[PDB]
Design a protein around this ligand. Structure first.
Ligand SMILES: [Mg+2]
Ligand SMILES: [Mg+2]
Ligand SMILES: [Mg+2]
Ligand SMILES: [Mg+2]
Ligand SMILES: [Mg+2]
Ligand SMILES: [Mg+2]
Ligand SMILES: [Mg+2]
Ligand SMILES: [Mg+2]
Ligand SMILES: [Mg+2]
Ligand SMILES: [Mg+2]
Ligand SMILES: [Mg+2]
Ligand SMILES: [Mg+2]
Ligand SMILES: [Mg+2]
Ligand SMILES: [Mg+2]
Ligand SMILES: [Mg+2]
Ligand SMILES: [Mg+2]
Ligand SMILES: [Mg+2]
Ligand SMILES: [Mg+2]
Ligand SMILES: [Mg+2]
Ligand SMILES: [Mg+2]
Ligand SMILES: [Mg+2]
Ligand SMILES: [Mg+2]
Ligand SMILES: [Mg+2]
Ligand SMILES: [Mg+2]
Ligand SMILES: [Mg+2]
Ligand SMILES: [Mg+2]
Ligand SMILES: [Mg+2]
Ligand SMILES: [Mg+2]
Ligand SMILES: [Mg+2]
Ligand SMILES: [Mg+2]
Ligand SMILES: [Mg+2]
Ligand SMILES: [Mg+2]
Ligand SMILES: [Mg+2]
Ligand SMILES: [Mg+2]
Ligand SMILES: [Mg+2]
Ligand SMILES: [Mg+2]
Ligand SMILES: [Mg+2]
Ligand SMILES: [Mg+2]
Ligand SMILES: [Mg+2]
Ligand SMILES: [Mg+2]
Ligand SMILES: [Mg+2]
Ligand SMILES: [Mg+2]
Ligand SMILES: [Mg+2]
Ligand SMILES: [Mg+2]
Ligand SMILES: [Mg+2]
Ligand SMILES: [Mg+2]
Ligand SMILES: [Mg+2]
Ligand SMILES: [Mg+2]
Ligand SMILES: [Mg+2]
Ligand SMILES: [Mg+2]
Ligand SMILES: [Mg+2]
Ligand SMILES: [Mg+2]
Ligand SMILES: [Mg+2]
Ligand SMILES: [Mg+2]
Ligand SMILES: [Mg+2]
Ligand SMILES: [Mg+2]
Ligand SMILES: [Mg+2]
Ligand SMILES: [Mg+2]
Ligand SMILES: [Mg+2]
Ligand SMILES: [Mg+2]
Ligand SMILES: [Mg+2]
Ligand SMILES: [Mg+2]
Ligand SMILES: [Mg+2]
Ligand SMILES: [Mg+2]
Ligand SMILES: [Mg+2]
Ligand SMILES: [Mg+2]
Ligand SMILES: [Mg+2]
Ligand SMILES: [Mg+2]
Ligand SMILES: [Mg+2]
Ligand SMILES: [Mg+2]
Ligand SMILES: [Mg+2]
Ligand SMILES: [Mg+2]
Ligand SMILES: [Mg+2]
Ligand SMILES: [Mg+2]
Ligand SMILES: [Mg+2]
Ligand SMILES: [Mg+2]
Ligand SMILES: [Mg+2]
Ligand SMILES: [Mg+2]
Ligand SMILES: [Mg+2]
Ligand SMILES: [Mg+2]
Ligand SMILES: [Mg+2]
Ligand SMILES: [Mg+2]
Ligand SMILES: [Mg+2]
Ligand SMILES: [Mg+2]
Ligand SMILES: [Mg+2]
Ligand SMILES: [Mg+2]
Ligand SMILES: [Mg+2]
Lengths: 56, 119, 209, 123, 114
RNA sequence: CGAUGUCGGCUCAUCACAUCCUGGGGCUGAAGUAGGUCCCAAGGGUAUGGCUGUUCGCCAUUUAAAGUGGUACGCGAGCUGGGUUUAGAACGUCGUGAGACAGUUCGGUCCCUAUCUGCCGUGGGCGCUGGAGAACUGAGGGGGGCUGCUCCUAGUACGAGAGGACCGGAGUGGACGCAUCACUGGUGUUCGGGUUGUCAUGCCAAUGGCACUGCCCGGUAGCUAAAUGCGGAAGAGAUAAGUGCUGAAAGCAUCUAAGCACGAAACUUGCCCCGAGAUGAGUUCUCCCUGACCCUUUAAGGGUCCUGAAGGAACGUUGAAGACGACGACGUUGAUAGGCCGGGUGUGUAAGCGCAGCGAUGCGUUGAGCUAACCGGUACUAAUGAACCGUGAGGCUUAACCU
RNA sequence: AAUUCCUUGUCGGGUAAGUUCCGACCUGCACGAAUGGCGUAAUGAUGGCCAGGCUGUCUCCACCCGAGACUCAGUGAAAU
RNA sequence: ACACAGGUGGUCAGGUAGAGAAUACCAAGGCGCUUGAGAGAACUCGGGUGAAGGAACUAGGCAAAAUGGUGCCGUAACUUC
RNA sequence: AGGACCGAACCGACUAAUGUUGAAAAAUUAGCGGAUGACUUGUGGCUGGGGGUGAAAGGCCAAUCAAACCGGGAGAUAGCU
């Protein structure tokens, strides 16, 4: 149920060893608007793979 | 397990899923593009596209089936008078999923689902 | 003696004129075609590596492609070794047909069983469930006791617990060969073999017989 | 598919109307008896003047099951109820002289050929 | 799959008569007893049909000698030598399991004509 | 004693061997069958019920057998709570009494989200000395190992008969285990239909909502057992008790001292699975990289430019793979998923119209309409050109070859 | 026997089998007459026992539907 | 102690079905309960279905399943009638 | 007529499961008893601690009861830890 000794800051760090975030590997650039975006997502302007897909 | 099973539960019961997908299919027919979560858009393909397939051939029986599936007369009218004829030659795939990031409130992966011949 | 690599196609029945329905697993055995021959001098043991099927050239990597090119054979969907018995010879480019099993009466079929994911002890080990009623608090499919008190003061290795079930290599032995159809590349064996439809199967002449 | 506490009808004229399986014979921990299987029974119901008496402990051969029997072609023969023929404890010969209702081919064996012959119909 | 379908097709019978649930059928089956094959008839109401190509089956229910007897035939089994429709029955269900709790007049099913 | 929770049951065990069964063997007051006793042997197996809280026991019926013990008389941070051991109450009994009882009786709160060890699984890191993709080897580890009955041998051997074998062979079972879904079934709130009440869609008709999926009847795929396939072995090695051969010490005898042989479910293998973090980090096959200059504290040094491969990752469509990771398939040179088309399957003859009928309803159109996960196809939609990581021939010393 | 230790008394019934139950017997360890005796229809969320029906209580579990559990985003404890 | 499934006296009392102020669906009216998104493992919780068997479970049929309405017919011992 | 019957409200609380660092310092859900009475309920009042009140359980008397709470004697005493 509960700890019998206080785990160390060492043990806590070793547990958090796997808590690291992963940066997005690389952003794509829309071929028309030229702006960066996630792979397979539309750009913030509403571009995807060149064509304007949503009116702003 | 889940071998070869189809259909997302979406953390709802069956009646809620059916009702929600009626509302969302009606919204998509009405507006021709909606923003919703990516899993719901993927599941909405299988509700909306059969309706367009049904609407390609106009008969009283097909109108009534579409009205049973959608329970909205103006949605049925738009289907059978616009999208059936608009999609007559298109062999399926009447919608398009466009991923659009994440909601602020819950970080849900969002997507636009639109009719293919909208713009 | 060597086996072939086939694919599980499905299950059906064979009606005999006598009146018996034989449940058969249908196994498509395309031409197994040799890629490497191993021997005591270079490898320290005798075996043939064979491939089967086909693979997209755009997913055959250059290491794989060069291996297949050295064999002088089309890329398959995988590579499997079979140990050779005494006085058993194959050349690097041979195609081995299902006709190999035209004589043999029983085979052993190895596959990857269907994966059941993380299974409870009831499913995985046939544990008896506890009482569904009669006061049982939250303990209907739980495994019960897992050890003894202070001696040994631990849980033993190999203790039957919940975990991954299936999705592992399973060999079913001494399946009777019902039909060898070399024309259509079929091997029909009586009974069920491990794996799902369309999964890879290793078929050897039965070791026990 | 008969187990302990199962009530069987009686396909013979030994006198019993209802019997209960109290033991599935022929193996440790054996769960069920199908057709052709010998079970231990106690007689729960009998006619006033019959060969057998209520509360008698004896043997029986299961002849019809509601679970049914499979045939080599995969066919199954089911019955509307479970029924057995009473047998002597020692000889394991039927006590009655008449077999009621149909029986099946799984009885065709020297142990129960008398039952097979006496039966009106053999599926 | 094409392979399994071909394997079952080259094995299916080509002469199975069209019958429906509620039909009374006489199924003549091969009985081997001793060293001699004879042909035993089983007649009754079709209470269920499973159409699965080679794995098609049908259930026939009769009352023989007082006992209710159901028999599931594998349609394309060589054991089933023949099927004949004696009476053509009018029902609205695909599977007549409700006849299991019926005897006599209650178990009557009317004949579909025309 | 600043708490180590009792009996029994359940669940799950694990070890011992003083062995219940199965296996081997000696003696027998062992003819055979069946026994008795002792020795070896722990591989596997080793009841369900009735009564009682029971353990036990008795009984009923099984079984090859229903072993004996250790494990906090294993197992309550796993369950129960019948017994026991609080407070209520009663009886017998004791006591003037309060009350009490190795008496009885009825009733009577069982907490803990797991940090560490352990265990079952499943990943991330680095290592394995250039990197990468595969296929392996097999140190080691684990799993498995049970048995009935019938027939043949043969009514033979044995026996006065009654009875009735060893050895050997064949078949078919029980329990257990693995796999699987072709069958038989279950399920199948994602399919079809029936139907009650009610509300709504303006109304009729037709539908939808809600009522446990409203209640039901069926049922696809998947998953499943009760379904059906398969398994335990054979063989080999070394042995146990035991049996011997030859054979002295000890002129004989002696299974032993030298030598030689046989000998069991035990051991090592043989079968299945894991498995090179096997840091002792192994092998084989294939693939990739063949540029410049600076630097000083000059060495397995650091730097800049150029270069960025094999491959990997990431992303996306996903899977009979899956908690998540992982693993597999696919990404336009594409069937990966959805849709679409055809089929199948299931349900059971839709709607509309017509006719018959006073009407409910029936008949016809019509085996209609609808039909999930299935099958076969189909680029319609979505799987993007990239970018990212990963480099640029890979230390020293010896030895052997090559020139 | 809400009372009986011996005791699971004995006999009978019920069950295949019944330390419980019911009916008796009387050997009342240690019932007994208003701290009432013995009966008693009706009543009882009362105690015991039996039977029919019913059933996942069980043989022996399977599948399914939902809420968690699991992953992501936000907030963010506790005993020890 | 909380924007806490608890407690808090009185009045009002629509429709369809219904005996009903039960219950179901609705009206007027008022709400969706102040974390969401996915996934669809074990296991836990609350439910549905279940072959064959049917109390073999267990201390005990605990829990489930079952019965269930109105009219009518019919209804035992015993009884304080 | 009835401390009559079945059954909502209302009053209770027999079983079960959950919950047991709870939604809750006693509840939830499914069942369950009473439901014209020795009923239930609002408002106000009275009974005060060796006292009350008790269809009696040592029950209850402000989450406290084999002698309430609060303050005081008081830094009781503690051969104990
Ligand atoms: Mg400590
Ligand atoms: Mg973490
Ligand atoms: Mg799918
Ligand atoms: Mg959620
Ligand atoms: Mg609903
Ligand atoms: Mg899986
Ligand atoms: Mg059990
Ligand atoms: Mg509890
Ligand atoms: Mg529970
Ligand atoms: Mg102590
Ligand atoms: Mg302590
Ligand atoms: Mg010994
Ligand atoms: Mg002996
Ligand atoms: Mg042992
Ligand atoms: Mg052992
Ligand atoms: Mg050992
Ligand atoms: Mg061994
Ligand atoms: Mg001890
Ligand atoms: Mg103990
Ligand atoms: Mg023990
Ligand atoms: Mg413990
Ligand atoms: Mg205990
Ligand atoms: Mg402990
Ligand atoms: Mg108790
Ligand atoms: Mg007391
Ligand atoms: Mg690793
Ligand atoms: Mg081993
Ligand atoms: Mg199946
Ligand atoms: Mg299938
Ligand atoms: Mg199925
Ligand atoms: Mg209408
Ligand atoms: Mg309706
Ligand atoms: Mg509504
Ligand atoms: Mg409502
Ligand atoms: Mg089915
Ligand atoms: Mg051997
Ligand atoms: Mg040897
Ligand atoms: Mg000699
Ligand atoms: Mg000598
Ligand atoms: Mg053996
Ligand atoms: Mg597709
Ligand atoms: Mg193509
Ligand atoms: Mg069809
Ligand atoms: Mg119609
Ligand atoms: Mg309809
Ligand atoms: Mg017609
Ligand atoms: Mg059809
Ligand atoms: Mg279709
Ligand atoms: Mg396809
Ligand atoms: Mg007394
Ligand atoms: Mg006594
Ligand atoms: Mg007695
Ligand atoms: Mg007695
Ligand atoms: Mg009983
Ligand atoms: Mg009892
Ligand atoms: Mg008595
Ligand atoms: Mg007295
Ligand atoms: Mg007196
Ligand atoms: Mg007196
Ligand atoms: Mg009195
Ligand atoms: Mg979080
Ligand atoms: Mg703290
Ligand atoms: Mg709130
Ligand atoms: Mg509140
Ligand atoms: Mg009303
Ligand atoms: Mg109401
Ligand atoms: Mg909330
Ligand atoms: Mg679930
Ligand atoms: Mg149910
Ligand atoms: Mg169903
Ligand atoms: Mg059942
Ligand atoms: Mg059914
Ligand atoms: Mg049934
Ligand atoms: Mg019992
Ligand atoms: Mg028991
Ligand atoms: Mg109950
Ligand atoms: Mg119920
Ligand atoms: Mg009253
Ligand atoms: Mg009270
Ligand atoms: Mg309540
Ligand atoms: Mg009442
Ligand atoms: Mg006081
Ligand atoms: Mg007291
Ligand atoms: Mg109080
Ligand atoms: Mg005092
Ligand atoms: Mg003083
Ligand atoms: Mg002091």
């Amino acid at each position: 149920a509960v700890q019998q000794n206080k785990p160390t800051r060492s043990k806590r760090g070793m547990r958090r060893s796997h808590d690291a975030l992963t940066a997005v590997t690389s952003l794509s650039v829309d071929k028309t608007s030229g702006e960066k975006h996630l792979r397979h997502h539309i750009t913030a302007d509403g571009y995807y793979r060149g064509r304007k897909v949503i009116a702003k | 397990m889940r071998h070869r099973k189809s259909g997302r539960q979406l953390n709802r019961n069956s009646s809620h899923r059916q009702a929600m997908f009626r509302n969302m299919a009606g919204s998509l027919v009405r507006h021709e593009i909606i923003k919703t979560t990516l899993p719901k858009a993927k599941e909405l393909r299988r509700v909306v596209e059969p309706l367009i397939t049904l609407a390609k051939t106009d008969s009283v029986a097909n109108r009534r089936l579409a009205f049973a599936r959608t329970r909205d007369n103006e949605i049925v009218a738009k289907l059978f008078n616009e999208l059936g004829p608009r999609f007559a030659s298109r062999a399926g795939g009447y919608t398009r999923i466009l991923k659009c990031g994440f909601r602020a409130g819950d970080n849900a992966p969002m997507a636009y689902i639109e009719l293919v011949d909208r713009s | 003696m060597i086996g072939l690599v086939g694919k599980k196609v499905g299950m059906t029945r064979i009606f005999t004129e006598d009146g018996v329905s034989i449940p058969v697993t249908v196994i498509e055995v395309e031409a197994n075609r040799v890629t490497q021959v191993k021997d005591l001098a270079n490898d320290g043991y005798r075996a043939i590596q064979v491939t089967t099927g086909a693979k997209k050239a755009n997913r055959v990597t250059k290491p794989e492609a060069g291996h297949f090119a050295k064999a002088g054979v089309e890329a398959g969907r995988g590579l499997w070794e079979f140990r050779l018995a005494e006085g058993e010879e194959f050349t690097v480019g041979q195609s081995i047909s299902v006709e190999l099993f035209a004589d043999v009466k029983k085979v052993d079929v190895t596959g990857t069983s269907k994966g059941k994911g993380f299974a409870g002890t009831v499913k995985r080990w046939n544990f008896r469930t506890q009482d569904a009623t009669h006061g049982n608090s939250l303990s209907h499919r739980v495994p019960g006791s897992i050890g003894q008190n202070q001696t040994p003061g631990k849980v033993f290795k190999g203790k039957k617990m919940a975990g991954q079930m299936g999705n592992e290599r399973v060999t079913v032995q001494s399946l009777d060969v019902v039909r060898v159809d070399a024309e259509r590349n079929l091997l029909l064996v009586k009974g069920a073999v491990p794996g799902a439809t369309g999964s890879d199967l290793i078929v050897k002449p039965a070791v026990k017989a | 598919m008969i187990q302990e506490q199962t009530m069987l009808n009686v396909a013979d004229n030994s006198g019993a109307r209802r019997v209960m399986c109290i033991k599935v014979l022929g193996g440790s921990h054996r769960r069920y008896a199908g057709v052709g299987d010998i079970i231990k029974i106690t007689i729960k119901e009998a006619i006033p003047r019959g060969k057998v008496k209520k509360g008698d402990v004896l043997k029986a051969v299961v002849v019809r099951t509601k679970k049914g029997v499979r045939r080599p072609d995969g066919s199954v023969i089911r019955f509307d109820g479970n029924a057995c023929v009473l047998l002597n404890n020692n000889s394991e010969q039927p006590i009655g002289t008449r077999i009621f209702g149909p029986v099946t081919r799984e009885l065709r064996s020297e142990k129960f050929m008398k039952i097979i012959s006496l039966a009106p119909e053999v599926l | 799959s094409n392979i399994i379908k071909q394997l079952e097709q080259e094995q299916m019978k080509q002469d199975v008569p069209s019958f429906r649930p509620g039909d009374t059928v006489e199924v003549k089956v091969w009985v081997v007893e001793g060293s001699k094959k004879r042909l035993q008839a089983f007649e009754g109401v079709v209470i269920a049909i499973r159409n699965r190509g080679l794995h098609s089956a049908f259930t026939v229910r009769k009352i023989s000698n007082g006992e209710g007897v159901e028999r599931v035939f594998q349609t394309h089994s060589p054991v089933v030598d023949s099927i004949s429709v004696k009476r053509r029955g009018a029902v609205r269900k695909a599977k007549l399991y409700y006849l299991r709790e019926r005897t006599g007049k209650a178990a009557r099913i009317k004949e579909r004509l025309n």
